[PDB]
């Protein structure tokens, strides 16, 4: 019942893995479904993405909640098309189903990759979900014509999504991605300098070890903006009666003396 990680693992494990034939088959289906989408777009003259959405809505079914009226009108706006040039629509439906299967089958690689990113400010399930987003992107961009295995192309996208989510969401005060990379590089450099020197390095040593464009003052500013806020509810003392925010005075509202 509880422990949602076990529930999610059970639901992913209920889906069997894939062999080479099945994986290549599904990838080829996805590619031809996209080509069929574009062919049908050219035939009807309409926007390809909207017809893609109609195919996705029809596959997902009524169960999944663009409205039913519009998609129904375009659905019968496509059934009117004659044979020989109609196959495209069936191929698009099949390809979308293949995309769903492929994602469902490759969900476990996301967990395998994400299990080694815990302890960076994001919970395990959040990392898993962001890895799933990266997996969807990799599925969309995968090219089976190169005869590479799917996981080889999927791992890069999963890692990129997880890293981007960590850089974006780990801090209460959002710090841009380039600045986050700068902070990580600074910390790693400081750790290497401490390992070499046998003691905590000074800011000038870190500035020298970063390279051109770095002085001790800039390192000081970077460490200043990398400080994370503390909780107003941090317990002070042994008894559970004193919090940190109990020691912080209000400096905004005017005092009775000031008002007088």
């Amino acid at each position: 019942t509880s422990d949602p990680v076990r529930q999610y693992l059970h639901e992913i494990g209920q889906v069997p893995l894939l062999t080479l034939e099945e994986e290549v088959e599904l990838a080829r289906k996805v590619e031809e479904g996209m080509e069929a989408i574009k062919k049908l777009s050219e035939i009807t003259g309409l926007d390809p993405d909207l017809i893609r959405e109609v195919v996705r809505a029809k596959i997902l079914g009524s169960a999944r909640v663009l409205d039913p009226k519009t998609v129904e009108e375009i659905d019968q706006k496509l059934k009117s098309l004659p044979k020989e040039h109609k196959r495209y629509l069936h191929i698009a439906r099949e390809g979308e189903a293949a995309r769903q299967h492929l994602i469902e089958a490759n969900l476990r690689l996301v967990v395998s990759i994400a299990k080694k990113y815990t302890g960076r400010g994001l919970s395990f399930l959040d990392l898993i979900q962001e890895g799933n987003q990266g997996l969807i992107r990799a599925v969309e961009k995968f090219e089976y014509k190169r005869r590479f295995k799917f996981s080889t192309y999927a791992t890069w996208w999963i890692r990129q999504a997880i890293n981007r989510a960590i850089a974006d969401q780990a801090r209460t005060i959002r710090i841009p991605v380039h600045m986050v990379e700068t902070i990580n590089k600074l910390s790693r450099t400081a750790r290497q300098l401490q390992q070499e020197l046998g003691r905590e390095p000074t800011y000038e040593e870190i500035a020298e070890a970063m390279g051109p464009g770095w002085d001790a003052k800039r390192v000081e500013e970077t460490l200043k903006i990398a400080q994370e806020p503390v909780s107003l509810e941090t317990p002070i003392g042994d008894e559970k009666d004193s919090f940190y925010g109990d020691f912080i005075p209000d400096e905004h509202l005017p005092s009775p003396v000031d008002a007088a």
Partner: protein, 1361 residues
């Protein structure tokens, strides 16, 4: 501005929440990392919540007032006060609905009760573990049709929604016994190692080779995973056509000639349950479409569907396959729960439950009633059930979840910000995933995470593992955590606050102070009265302006002399409040006039230390300053120390002489006894005088002259008046303790000069000689009890002002005479009697005997142990008696003896430990040792004896430590249950009363023995006589308040057999709503006069009960017994009582024992354990509710048997027993008030012509009013039974949701009140305190608070007008 009169709480609709919000929070950003300004659309956005600066937009275009209500075009920030940042709310629009955990996890669940779903089913559906069916659409599961409100697992839903399509991996290089496209029954083997299990068609998957004929001869083509087969099985081919397409153009397989095609070595076989339809032209339904029987598929309608299923058009074989499925509509989570909630029709459900409530089954009726409670609450409040599912989540204003820069430049934030950030991140990710057409597993996981995030925001640490911040184990503080607990909003910021104009300091004895005065340090007073001092400095020439006065007062070295005189003028006539924690009763806060002193210590009067429970070993006290005229008047009239002289709990004096004062008065009022003469015989006084001059007889020896006892002092020294006797004392002729003859008040008194001096002290204090002579007891030494009686009599006869004068005089003279008396403690003052040695040897004798009796088989282990214990107990008692006999006979002025006898300090047990012996000690297991400590504290203990006593010392310390907490909790519960009870009217008009008995049955059932005087006083003093009483030719009229003299007269009449019980009014029989009346309460015990209308007697009762319990009552027995009685707990040592009347017939077998109660109608039986002890005998008569065994009686069984009155009397008597055992004086009224609140409710047995339900608990007053109206209309009255519940359950069942929520169980109270839409009418004190209003008690009572005052001149002018 209209006055606030009621507060209502109710569920909030999504429309209401969206109307609250000033904008949607779309981003989890808080502030920018460079500029430390709020981020747009974030949790701190000025566009949503308001500007940080007053009258200034974000971009600075407008920075001035008059632009109120104007929104800047560039930045979107309104121009207004910044304080709106603590009022303006936001909201989050959830992608999917989420359930409010309060209505899910508070047992029993409101949503589960409404939808008839168990907790397990609700948890399974809400957190995406099982589906729930809506509109099954004619689906079949395992041969049984599916119905609404049915729970399907993931497997059952997947089978029903899609179908069965199993795949079997054919081993490499093995062909299958079956062909592609052939129906396969269950069990039919498809390979040498594969056996099918489901029915339907088999389909080849990835054939490893293709055999293509050529017009004939065959040929083989290998099929690798990286290539696919295009031509369907059993289809001819042409020259040049391709069959097995490959990725590489050179790898493609083009057919050389015309030939048939076959596919072999399939990688796997897919067995499905489906129907098949070939076609030869354009088809109509594409892949992923669901069809019904008889629908057009292809061939212009030539083929038609025969079954329900989903259509997939496989172009490889040019065949339409309908996989057996349904369009069933089963959903998961809060969306499904909300859909079920909106379809609910409450009136039809109410009718169904009313029909169900007619079942003979009691359990069914109880379940229907429980569901009906919720249904009717929703119907009455007008709330919609679907509002229990959230669509928009409100967002607290930022100023109540601040992100602030600490003085050190770092940032500090609230946990609510992190919870909101998690919620927003998960919602945004869910929206993105939905916009991407993600598979259903990912969407289900994301929705589960969103539900968990909402739960964590509302109530963290309730379902599952609590959310914590990384790197710590500390749970994040949710809104529920903020609301509830000892540190929550209610108990920490609403029922108690930190205040201005207050200080604290160590306390020092103030012996030169008057009763109404306290010593206040100069610096403390200057800080406390600073604005008044500034005004006074402005009035004088000390400062040109208030700012200059403040600057001058800022620095210590800048203060002069005249400011102190200005301060002395400021405080003239004003009072301050002194308070010592813990405040156990109202006397813990008292008003005093401050006298400015030097130093840093508060000076306290010695006579209020007992009321404060204050000593001078480091105690600290707090000082508060009442500001306005009303506050000062209340402090001076009601809370002045000199106006509070009697205890509100018992009516006995509370400010009284103690310690050194008692010692001095006793020393001067005790008389010498001498043995030199020892009853000699004399014929004439001259012979006695000559004998005394010769040295043969002492001055105070009891001699006999002329047949009358006297002494030489009485004959030798005869004084004309007290002045002559005291002048002789001043000359050393006689001592204060010598017995002489003095002429006073026209009489010749054989007394001592000290007693005459005490009489003069009293007479000069009260400024009345005859009354003072009447008050004092001349012929006894003045000790604690006599002094207390004198103070009480002086109060009654003269008033509190003269009583205060007398108290001050007694204090002064007691201190003066204690200083010069010569009281000291030396080691030789702990006199060891000689008898002890003998008493020890005697004991050492019998012990040997005991050992003999154990070596010869005559004694067991238990018998010998008990005999030794008894012997040592009796030896200890003998040693105590010997010690005190030695003190009485030989050293009557011994310091320890005088200290114990006067009541100044010490009790006989401690003195025995000092002098005689410590005695027996208890092991940590609770059993006694066999050897006692035979050494006293003067002799010195050995190491082993000291270690043995350490067990008891430690146990006593731990006892104290737990007891104080348990008593505090009990006192809080009592305050919560009685806080609304006020004296609200003069007379309720009732004719009911209670009968206080004067005789109690004996423990040996011999006869009725007269009760102790203290118990009768505690039960009778101050009460109003309900009926006229004639005793000893004295007529006590109806409506008379019983004074102490009347109580004594009643006791005297009872001792003469004229009366057996007294009928009096009581709170148990009062008819006043939310309180009592003046007559049913009686005296205000702190004033010895009828109670004033408006007195908060409930608080007084709770404090009176709770104060002694702290420490006084030891810890079935002690404080646990009192707690068990006030909570109405069923005893674990429960006794057996008779439910009906009848005669007793004990039926005993050698294996079992039983008691039959045989009435004239029926004969009942009671089986009890044989080892028990019976209070009844064969052939006896027992009434209903009488006990048959020893032990504590269950109050609920007594309520069923005898009724309400008997249970009230039992509870009162049993609670008073514990307090009497400890020696605590406490009036019955307070316990009666608490018990009256305990018995406040009834249960409906038959509704009659009412809308009530059977078994519905409701207030007794409300049902009586309902019955009165029903009788007025002429209907069938409601039938009810009384109920009894403990203080906790009675307090939690009140009408006011504010007090119940601030008491305990906050989430349950709040959710029930919100469901019901309850309105709080602000009747009690706690609600008005929470709202910061004027409490309906004391000066805030409607009886007195509209009084006007005017002079005669102004009144006449208005009269002329």
């Amino acid at each position: 501005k209209k006055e606030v009169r009621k507060v209502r709480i109710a569920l909030a609709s999504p429309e209401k929440i969206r109307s609250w919000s000033y904008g949607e929070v779309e981003k989890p950003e808080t502030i920018n990392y460079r500029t430390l300004k709020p981020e747009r659309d974030g949790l701190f956005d000025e566009r949503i919540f308001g500007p940080i600066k007053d009258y200034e937009c974000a971009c600075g275009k407008y920075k001035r007032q008059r632009f109120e209500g104007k929104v800047c075009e560039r930045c979107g920030v309104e121009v207004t006060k910044s304080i709106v940042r603590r009022y303006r709310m936001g909201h989050i629009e959830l992608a999917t609905p989420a359930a409010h955990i309060w209505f899910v996890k508070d047992v029993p669940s409101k949503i589960g009760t409404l939808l008839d779903l168990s907790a397990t089913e609700l948890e399974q559906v809400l957190y995406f573990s099982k589906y729930i069916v809506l509109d099954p659409k004619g689906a079949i599961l395992n041969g049984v049709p599916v119905e609404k409100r049915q729970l399907l697992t993931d497997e059952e839903y997947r089978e029903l929604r899609y179908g069965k399509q199993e795949t079997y991996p054919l081993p490499p290089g093995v062909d299958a016994l079956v062909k592609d496209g052939e129906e396969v029954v269950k069990g039919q083997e498809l390979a040498p190692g594969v056996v099918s299990r489901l029915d339907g068609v088999a389909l080849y998957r990835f054939p490893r080779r293709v055999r293509v004929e050529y017009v004939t001869e065959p040929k083989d083509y290998r099929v690798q995973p990286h290539m696919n087969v295009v031509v369907p099985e059993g289809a001819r081919v042409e020259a040049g056509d391709k069959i097995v397409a490959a990725i590489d153009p050179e790898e493609e397989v083009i057919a050389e000639a015309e030939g048939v095609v076959h596919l072999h070595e399939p990688a796997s076989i897919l067995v499905v349950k489906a129907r098949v339809y070939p076609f030869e032209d354009d088809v109509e339904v594409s892949t992923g479409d669901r069809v019904a029987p008889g629908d057009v598929l292809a061939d212009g309608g030539k083929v038609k569907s025969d079954v329900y299923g989903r259509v997939e058009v496989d172009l490889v074989r040019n065949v339409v396959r309908v996989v057996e499925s349904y369009d069933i509509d089963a959903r998961m989570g809060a969306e499904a729960i909300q859909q079920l909630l909106k379809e609910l029709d409450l009136e039809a459900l109410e009718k169904e439950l009313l029909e169900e409530m007619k079942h003979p089954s009691r359990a069914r009726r109880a379940k229907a009633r429980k569901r009906l409670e919720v249904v009717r609450a929703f119907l009455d409040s007008g709330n919609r059930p679907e509002w229990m599912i959230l669509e928009a989540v409100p967002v607290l204003p930022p100023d109540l979840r601040p992100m602030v820069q600490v003085d050190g430049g770092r940032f500090a934030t609230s946990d609510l910000n992190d919870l909101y950030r998690r919620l927003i991140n998960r919602n945004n990710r869910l929206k993105k995933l939905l916009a991407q057409g993600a598979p259903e597993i990912i969407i289900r996981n994301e929705k589960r995470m969103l539900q968990e995030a909402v739960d964590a925001l509302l109530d963290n640490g309730r379902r599952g593992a609590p959310v914590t911040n990384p790197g710590s184990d500390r749970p994040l503080r949710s809104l529920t955590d903020i609301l509830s607990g000892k540190q929550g909003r209610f108990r920490q910021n609403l029922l108690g606050k930190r205040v201005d104009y207050s200080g604290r300091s160590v306390i020092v004895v103030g012996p030169q102070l008057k009763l109404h005065q306290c010593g206040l340090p100069k610096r403390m007073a200057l800080e406390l009265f600073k604005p008044f001092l500034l005004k006074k400095m402005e009035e004088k020439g000390i400062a040109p302006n208030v700012k200059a006065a403040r600057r001058m007062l800022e620095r210590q070295r800048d203060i002069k002399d005249e400011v102190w005189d200005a301060l002395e003028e400021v405080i003239h006539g004003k009072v301050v409040l002194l308070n010592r924690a813990p405040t156990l009763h109202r006397l813990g806060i008292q008003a005093f006039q401050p006298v400015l002193v030097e130093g840093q210590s508060i000076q306290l009067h010695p006579l209020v230390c007992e009321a404060f429970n204050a000593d001078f070993d480091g105690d600290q006290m707090a000082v508060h300053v009442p500001l306005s005229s009303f506050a000062q008047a209340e402090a001076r009239i009601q809370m002045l120390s000199a106006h509070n002289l009697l205890s509100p709990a018992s009516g006995e004096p509370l400010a009284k002489p103690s310690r050194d004062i008692i010692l001095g008065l006793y020393y001067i009022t005790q008389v010498r006894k001498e043995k030199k003469g020892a009853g000699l015989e004399f014929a004439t006084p001259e012979e006695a005088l000559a004998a005394h001059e010769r040295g043969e007889v002492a001055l105070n020896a009891p001699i006999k002259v002329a047949g009358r006892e006297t002494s030489v002092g009485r004959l030798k020294y005869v004084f004309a008046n007290p002045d002559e006797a005291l002048l002789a004392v001043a000359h050393g002729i006689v001592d204060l303790q010598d017995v002489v003859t003095v002429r006073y008040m026209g009489k010749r008194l054989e007394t001592s000069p000290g007693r005459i001096l005490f009489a003069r002290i009293v007479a000069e204090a009260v400024e009345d000689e005859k009354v003072a002579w009447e008050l004092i007891q001349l012929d006894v030494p003045q000790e604690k009890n006599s002094l207390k009686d004198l103070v009480y009599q002086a109060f009654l006869r003269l008033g509190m002002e003269k009583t205060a004068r007398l108290l001050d005089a007694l204090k002064y003279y007691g201190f003066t005479f204690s200083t010069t008396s010569g009281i000291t403690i030396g080691i030789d003052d702990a006199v060891i009697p000689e008898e002890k040695k003998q008493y020890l040897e005697e004991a050492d004798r019998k012990l040997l005997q005991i050992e003999q009796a154990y070596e010869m088989g005559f004694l067991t282990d238990r018998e010998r142990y008990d005999q030794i214990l008894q012997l040592w107990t009796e030896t200890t008692e003998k040693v105590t008696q010997a010690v005190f006999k030695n003190f009485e006979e030989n050293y009557p002025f011994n310091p320890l003896y005088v200290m114990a006898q006067s009541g100044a300090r010490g009790n006989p047990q401690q003195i025995r430990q000092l002098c005689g012996l410590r005695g027996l000690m208890q092991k940590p297991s609770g059993e006694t040792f066999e050897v006692p400590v035979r050494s006293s504290f003067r002799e010195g203990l050995t190491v082993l004896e000291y270690f043995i006593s350490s067990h008891g010392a430690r146990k006593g310390g731990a006892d104290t430590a737990l007891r104080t907490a348990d008593s505090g909790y009990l006192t809080r519960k009592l305050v919560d249950v009685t806080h609304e009870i006020v004296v609200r009217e003069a007379d309720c008009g009732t004719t009911n009363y209670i009968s206080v008995p004067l005789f109690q049955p004996d423990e040996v059932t011999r006869s009725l023995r007269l009760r102790k005087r203290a118990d009768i006083e505690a039960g009778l003093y101050g009460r109003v006589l309900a009926r006229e009483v004639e005793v000893l030719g004295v007529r006590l009229e109806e409506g008379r308040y019983l004074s102490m003299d009347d109580v004594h007269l009643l006791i005297k009449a009872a001792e003469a057999g004229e009366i057996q019980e007294v009928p009096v009014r009581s709170p148990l029989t009062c008819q006043t709503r939310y309180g009592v009346c003046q007559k049913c309460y009686g005296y205000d015990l702190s004033m010895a006069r009828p109670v004033s209308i408006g007195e908060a007697v409930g608080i007084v009762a709770a404090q009176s009960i709770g104060e002694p319990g702290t420490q006084l009552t030891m810890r079935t027995q002690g404080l646990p017994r009192v707690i068990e009685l006030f909570e109405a707990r069923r005893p674990k040592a429960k006794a057996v009582i008779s439910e009906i009347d009848g005669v007793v017939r004990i039926e005993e077998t050698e294996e079992k024992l039983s008691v039959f109660v045989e009435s004239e109608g029926f004969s009942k039986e009671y089986k009890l354990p044989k080892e028990a002890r019976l209070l009844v005998k064969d052939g006896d008569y027992v009434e209903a509710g009488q006990p048959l065994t020893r032990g504590a009686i269950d109050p609920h069984q007594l309520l069923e048997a005898k009724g309400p009155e008997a249970v009230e009397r039992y509870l009162v008597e049993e609670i008073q027993k514990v307090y009497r055992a400890q020696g605590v004086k406490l009036h019955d009224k307070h316990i009666e008030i608490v018990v009256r609140q305990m018995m406040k409710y009834v249960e409906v047995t038959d509704p009659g012509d009412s809308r009530l339900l059977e078994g519905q608990v409701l207030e007794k007053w409300d049902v009586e009013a309902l019955n009165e109206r029903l009788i007025a209309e002429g209907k069938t009255p409601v039938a009810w039974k009384p109920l009894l519940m403990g203080v906790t359950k009675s307090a939690l069942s009140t009408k006011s949701w504010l007090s119940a929520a601030s008491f305990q169980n906050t989430t349950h109270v709040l959710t029930e009140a919100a469901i019901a839409g309850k309105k709080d009418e602000l009747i009690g004190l706690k609600e008005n305190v929470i709202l910061g209003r004027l409490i309906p008690a004391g000066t805030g009572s409607d009886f007195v608070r509209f009084t006007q005052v005017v002079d005669q001149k102004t009144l006449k002018a208005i009269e002329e007008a």
